[PDB]
Design a protein around this ligand. Structure first.
Ligand SMILES: CO[C@@H]1O[C@H](CO)[C@H](O)[C@H](O)[C@H]1O
Ligand SMILES: CO[C@@H]1O[C@H](CO)[C@H](O)[C@H](O)[C@H]1O
Lengths: 504, 505, 504, 505
């Protein structure tokens, strides 16, 4: 296959594409934006101005399988064609059974057969516009459509590998404590799957404290029905709902993996506020609180990916990034600092603003992606090392201090909007990328004096070669007292600086 | 003739032009804008940017017959020529005896002979710059010129049918309780015409209350003079005055109908405020109050057409639209909402901003006519049906609910400027056009659940074929919970067209 | 001669240029703008945008005769060349002995010899930078150079007639009660010239009150010395000073008139405020108060021309326009209303904003001159008749009524900037030009009703033929209740309207 | 050599370049702007828009000698090439041992050997990022590199003379009362050099009060150690530190002078506030207070050059301009007034805004340089004479009166931004350049009346010939009552040039 996840020396998962480490400098289209060839083709030139390397775009089951057994390849065909013509990779979004909790993208022949494909019921007994995750018939229909899609992708793309990742469904779950369908209620009375029990026992010291505390509160039992093992409460309800989602979607993914395995991720509508109970957000989705349940249930799903529109970016990304879960953000705000923090601090696979086609005039973002592209080789090389960090000022922070081998780095912010990344490339050498901050280098060991030796501003050409534009000294470095990450000038955007240091 | 009104199966009057249903997406020029070939010709390109299909433009008697029996075809010729070259149909306004009550467009030779063509007199006795509607000499001279104009149009236009309608005179009436000319004072004493009596008897249940009440108050008599049948008051004065105008102009139209019958309408300066008495507005004009009088008196006038510049649009158009009177608005404000309301709610024949050449920079208006043009086939097919409605928010309204077959539609407004139309094209299919509203779809039968099935955005190509630009879903329909008529986007927004399918479960 | 003043049938003086009535739609250059060929030549395209037919431009003695007996024809020749090439007539301003009272344009060799060309002396005995009008040497040297200039103009322009008028000196006079030079003091003691006395006797009825009153206060004597005849005061001082200036300058003009007679005018710095005594303004210059002295002393000067920069435009022009003195305004503000008033109300020969080259972006002014040009034939034909008026609103006015044959015209203003002119061209026909006013037509005879019959908007083409652009009616004339002079549209400027009227 | 300092008849030092007097209408690049060929080459077109005749740009030892004995001529070669292609002369800044006090441009191989190239030590005893001026190894290595640079310049530029001046180091000195290195402390105990005693003896009447008063307070001794001759205090510490810097840098210049002598200047960071003690500003630098020490110690340095960023411009330039020290300003604000004052009042060799490449859209400054270029021959001819003054208004001044032979010039300002220069070219002739002032000419001798005779506005063509654009008179001169220096117009305004003839009567 031409896209794969491989763990490196530092234990970081890396995307390897056409043989090389690859980071998704991405954007996701608006939902409806891949729904005709003409609309989508109107967007490519805009997207190129933002220096994307990857576009996240949906295929909708309703359009792909408009009658059961009849498949329409027009949209996937034209999407791959356009991506190729414009220099983009694709992550394909599969709007099948569920998109933002609901089943609005299910085919007309699925919506109209509520007997074959039964709906979630509310606590009031109302059927809603959401297929039950307890509907086996819907699992199989969706699984067959998705497998057919991926078979086709293999058939037209196995060599070029334009398509580098798959997202089955979109923000799954219910806005309810549980499904009140008959199958849902019976499933709630069933034995906890041993797969979950075994996973927990094994990974206890590492479990989410949301799972652990409920399990332990009820005696950390290794058998029994859901209400025995996890109590009769909102949490046991969320846990068997999430199991069911993860199990249904795993089946969908397995069918594809069997024929053409690509990096596969499921995305979540975040727990918006800390007190929110399951059902305020989609109950069933891969939010961090149930990461363990998803991992135990869905081994054919590679990454649980947060959709981040909230300002608390640093805490959110640390919450979702685990040793078994690389940071992959398929939906975010169009804020360059977020990208630098994800890639630099957490070795992210993907950063993707939602509704990217709308932000074509965002020069600073475009230039930021340009700088990140220059740095992909160096970022890739240091993924997972303690020699790479992000830089992003949040309100009310004034400075950050870190150790890097022989040196202490004191990062001070010159504006609210200050961001970048720092890589130690050598005992006495650093690459600093970004804008509106300064870095002071001193000696860890206080029996020595550490100082900047020399600073060059530059960038990497299309060959990947470093080309210095200036040797920054004098006013530009306060006589080598400090690195000033002023940025590249046209308006200001992130710059790249090579700093050599010395001890004496 | 290449233009005619035909009633369809729902009872609605349609304009058939060159053998196809036609709706006037119109504009009327300022009054003096067709007075030379050069000035008119300077406007065509401006008008084209507005996506007009029809231009309303005057021929003035003073220019058409500058000396008695001498006719100048220069202006009508070049008007037709320009419309053809720029893709417009024409409705011709005839500024003859009267324009805005007065006779400023009568030929020099008519103005100068106050013996042959006597004037209205005021209550203090002064002759005003208005030819009396009791002056038979004026009626015949006007009729002969109008007839001469229409013969010419036939002669140069019978095969092409650039000209699709005629408006004899413009906003007729006097700013007086009555004319005080000796001939007027005599007329008022005369017997009420049996045509009026018989009309009232036969059409009683549909009569205006302003006429029925006065008739009824004076004993609903079936003979007698004006003052006997209608009392001695301002209303009987308005009635015999209105009868007079309708009679005079009917003759002018009939001469034209005899040789080249075109759809013909007369237009009114509205009763401007609800208490206004005849004379505050032109007394004699076809305001809704005297609609039955005009109908009884002028069978050669097809349509009485309101000139709407007031903000109370919905009430006004509902007042003028009757079984026997299609909605045709030759003068209006340049407001896209108004057009959508007239065409969608009332199946109108015409919507026409006055002074249209001034609005060439109104992109939202332009794109509104663009969308309406795409919809003419569909509008025309649903005229008079309960399966077509307008949408237009007015201040202080928040939402409208209607039933369409198996579905309830709740229309909710997302801004003050919200307008469009809705057409049910199938048991489970709707076309919704417009901007700044939302439509919630539910089952009429409470035992079932109705939902949106699928939503497409698009438009009709030049071949008249539907082309979807998107399948709107997810964010764009709140996951099929609602239709969002956000509009077509250039940001600036103008009306969009959405095809919505629904289902029951 | 290609230019001459000729009294028409109504007693109005007209300029006949190349055998046709001509009206100067003029502007005057800044003082230093014709001092080189290059600087003047840079202006002509600007001037053309303003639709001038005439430029007022100086020739400076200092440059024309830089050494005595040596004449430099460069500036005059290039000026005429440029005018011809750009479609302009010229009125030549002679900056000789005096310009704004002073002698700053006298040649170096005149300035440097205060023995030969003695200066004015102040009451304190200081010699000022003004040559004395009692210095005959200066008079003869000025006259000789001026004659040399006009002779040259004849030799290069007699057939073409680019030059249509001359202005000897500029705003002459002293900022003193009298000149205190020896010659001035002796001149004051002398007998009143018999030419003055006889002028006053013959024209007594029509004399300026300012001259009559002083004469009559002292016995209306027909002989005696200046202080005998006019008493010992500021006025007698002003009179003999004014007599001196007009005599000196009459000699200069006479020399030119002898070989090549052109319409000749002297311009004044106005009495700025009503109380102002002679010498607050240049004492000697042709202000209206001393118009009779100038007329008596200077028959070779055709017109006395006010320079009008003050806002009391209408009273000022009325004060200068007399039966023996056509209105000619060589210096003014760039206000189109003033032009329309001068030409329409007072049959003026010339309207000329000062510093015209500054005004090249004045669209409204330029279009005003376009309209006046279209109107020149019609204006010409009605000069001095009671069938032509101007229209100009001043603050605090709002309507003018006038009678014209059978009709009363009520002119009502729709804005503060309201101006134009009205010509009755027939018993029942009028041409109205202008902007921001309305005209109501009624019958003078109350037994009749007068009304507008028909209105056309239009203009005159380059052949002088009327071309209508619209028949205005309906909204555009309130159904013939009124003529609306709305203007030509692009921003609005004066329009031209033909109105027929009728009586019933 | 194609660039030389030479004293004229009025005792003024002039720069003679390619046989002709030359004034630097200059600008200095940002520090890092000459660090690659690509970055510098991106600037030339911009620099041309400002009408510079000279660029000040650095060469950095760290790049010129990247390893000891290995020399990289890329940057100097490219700089000379670009200067030639764009019509500029160069003054080369040597960022060697010190730049703004510190050793940040010293080679990596100098930085890393603190044994061979020992550092300044603080009073606390810390070694700082500054090479001690008491380090002979450092002096020798800097000297060797500097000579290599200049030998190369000779080798590629001896005929053309693009390079017209040299600045060794940049704003040298320590932010300390003294260096606490062992060498420094022991040099403080040494005998005052006789070269300094002798200078102070010979030049006593012309000494800086700052040096003289301290010498005299300790008994004006002609022998002893620093603390003997100058006391034990901050000043004797400043004196010997300054001696050391000037001595070190003189050695550096001498090596260049011996193979290819060019006008050489050292620049100083100014005493920023009058109370400031040595060390607040760089202690060692050629500030005016220690001008005598620098002259005595460094005969191979031609000029001491102030870097002027402060608003008190007139006082500062007067402070630095002495008979033995022409005014040369390598670093200044981009203010045209400062240029006119420097060149006009003080016959300056050079005016140079710092960060010049940032200033490319400064039209008025570009036009001022255009006018100064036009005037260079006339400025050159009157350098040092009392027939040439500058004009510059400072806040809270309103007029300046000067005597010029037979006339008195009253200069009155019409705006806050009023500047230029005045030359008497003849007994009765002046050239006035500038903007926003007026000049009144009267007679010195009150028994005569002096007046303007004629005024011409104009300029000098590419051949150096005067061409009048106007004879100014009437309103333009208030009838020759005054010269109005209105400026050249474009309305945006910049300096004009006016020729005024006067006369006495
Ligand atoms: C309507 O979109 C959804 O909004 C939610 C908050 O209400 C979350 O942000 C989800 O990620 C997003 O897909
Ligand atoms: C002056 O125009 C007229 O104005 C009236 C109100 O005054 C009505 O609006 C008429 O319809 C309109 O034609």
């Amino acid at each position: 296959v031409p896209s794969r996840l491989v763990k490196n020396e530092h234990g970081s998962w890396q995307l390897i594409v056409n043989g090389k480490p690859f980071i998704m400098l991405a954007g996701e289209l608006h939902n409806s934006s891949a729904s005709t060839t003409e609309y989508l083709n109107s967007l490519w030139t805009s997207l190129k101005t933002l220096n994307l390397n990857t576009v996240l775009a949906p295929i909708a089951w309703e359009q792909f399988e408009p009658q059961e057994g009849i498949f329409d390849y027009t949209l996937i065909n034209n999407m791959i064609d356009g991506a190729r013509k414009n220099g983009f990779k694709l992550s394909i979004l599969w709007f099948g059974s569920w998109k933002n909790g609901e089943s609005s993208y299910a085919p007309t022949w699925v919506k109209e057969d509520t007997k074959r494909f039964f709906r979630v019921k509310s606590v009031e007994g109302k059927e809603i516009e959401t297929i039950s995750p307890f509907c086996e018939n819907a699992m199989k229909a969706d699984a067959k459509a998705f497998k057919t899609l991926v078979e086709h992708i293999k058939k037209v793309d196995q060599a070029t590998g334009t398509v580098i990742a798959l997202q089955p469904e979109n923000e799954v779950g219910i806005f309810q404590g549980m499904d009140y369908s008959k199958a849902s209620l019976a499933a709630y009375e069933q034995e906890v799957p041993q797969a979950l029990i075994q996973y927990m026992k094994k990974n206890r010291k590492n479990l989410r404290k949301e799972l652990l505390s409920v399990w332990e509160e009820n005696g950390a039992r290794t058998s029994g029905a859901w209400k025995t093992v996890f109590g009769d409460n909102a949490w046991s309800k969320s846990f068997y709902t999430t199991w069911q989602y993860a199990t249904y979607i795993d089946f969908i993914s397995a069918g594809a993996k069997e024929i053409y395995p690509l990096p596969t991720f499921c995305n979540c509508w975040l727990v918006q506020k800390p007190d929110d109970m399951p059902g305020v957000y989609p109950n069933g989705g891969p939010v961090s609180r149930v990461m363990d349940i998803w991992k135990a249930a869905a081994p054919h799903i590679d990454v649980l990916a947060p959709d981040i529109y909230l300002s608390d970016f640093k805490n959110i990304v640390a919450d979702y990034h685990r040793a078994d879960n690389p940071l992959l953000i398929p939906e975010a705000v169009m804020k360059p600092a977020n990208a630098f923090w994800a890639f630099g601090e957490h070795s992210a696979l993907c950063y993707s603003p939602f509704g990217i086609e709308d932000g074509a005039d965002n020069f600073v973002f475009a230039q930021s992606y340009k700088v990140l592209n220059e740095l992909i080789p160096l970022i890739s090389e240091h993924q997972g090392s303690d020699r790479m960090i992000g830089v992003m000022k949040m309100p009310g922070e004034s400075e950050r201090t870190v150790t890097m081998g022989d040196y202490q780095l004191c990062i001070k912010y010159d504006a609210e909007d200050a961001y970048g990344l720092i890589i130690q490339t050598g005992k006495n050498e650093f690459v600093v990328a970004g804008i509106n901050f300064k870095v002071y280098f001193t000696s860890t060991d206080k029996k020595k004096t550490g100082y900047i030796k020399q600073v060059w501003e530059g960038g990497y050409d299309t060959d990947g070669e470093w080309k210095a534009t200036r040797l920054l000294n004098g006013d530009e470095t306060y006589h080598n007292a400090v690195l000033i990450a002023k940025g590249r000038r046209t308006v200001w955007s992130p710059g790249i600086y090579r700093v050599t240091t010395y001890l004496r």
